[PDB]
Amino acid sequence: KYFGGFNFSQILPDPSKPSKRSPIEDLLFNKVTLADAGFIKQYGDCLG
Amino acid sequence: GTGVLTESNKKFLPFQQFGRDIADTTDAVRDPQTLEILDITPCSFGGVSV
Numbered sequence: 597k598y599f600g601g602f603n604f605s606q607i608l609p610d611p612s613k614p615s616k617r618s619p620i621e622d623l624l625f626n627k628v629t630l631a632d633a634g635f636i637k638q639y640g641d642c643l644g
Numbered sequence: 645g646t647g648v649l650t651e652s653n654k655k656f657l658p659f660q661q662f663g664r665d666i667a668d669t670t671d672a673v674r675d676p677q678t679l680e681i682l683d684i685t686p687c688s689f690g691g692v693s694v
């Protein structure tokens with residue numbers, strides 16, 4: 597990951613997270629997903 | 645109406661008799677004979693694609 601001293605760790609995907617997303621992307625995902633509602637898939641899973 | 649009737653954990657007041665949703669349609673009801681809070685959910689549906 598050496599790039600002549602430039603550091604791209606923040607934008608490069610992070611293998612540590614289960615989702616292969618950069619640290620920047622994780623901040624974006626959490627901050628805006630407020631009204632994303634439930635991902636229960638609207639099956640019988642959400643009884644109520 | 646037609647739907648799937650399930651036991652509801654949503655408590656009712658002793659005077660409460662039926663529960664209604666945002667759309668002003670009955671979603672939870674109390675059985676007349678045996679007083680239990682029953683949830684009402686419409687039967688599953690969806691679009692079909694070929």
Ligand SMILES: *[C@@H]1O[C@H](CO)[C@@H](O[C@@H]2O[C@H](CO)[C@@H](O)[C@H](O)[C@H]2NC(C)=O)[C@H](O)[C@H]1NC(C)=O
Nearest residue numbers: 597598599601602603604605606607610619620
């Ligand atoms: C590139 O930047 C990252 C973060 O911007 C640096 O990672 C930090 O490393 C130190 C020491 O290893 C830790 O104490 C910090 O917690 C780390 N930051 C984060 C956000 O995890 C990294 O050292 C920089 N340089 C290289 C070569 O990656």
Ligand SMILES: *[C@@H]1O[C@H](CO)[C@@H](O)[C@H](O)[C@H]1NC(C)=O
Nearest residue numbers: 674675676677678679680681
């Ligand atoms: C109706 O349900 C059974 C059948 O008699 C009985 O236990 C109950 O007392 C009856 N009356 C009422 C008001 O539920």
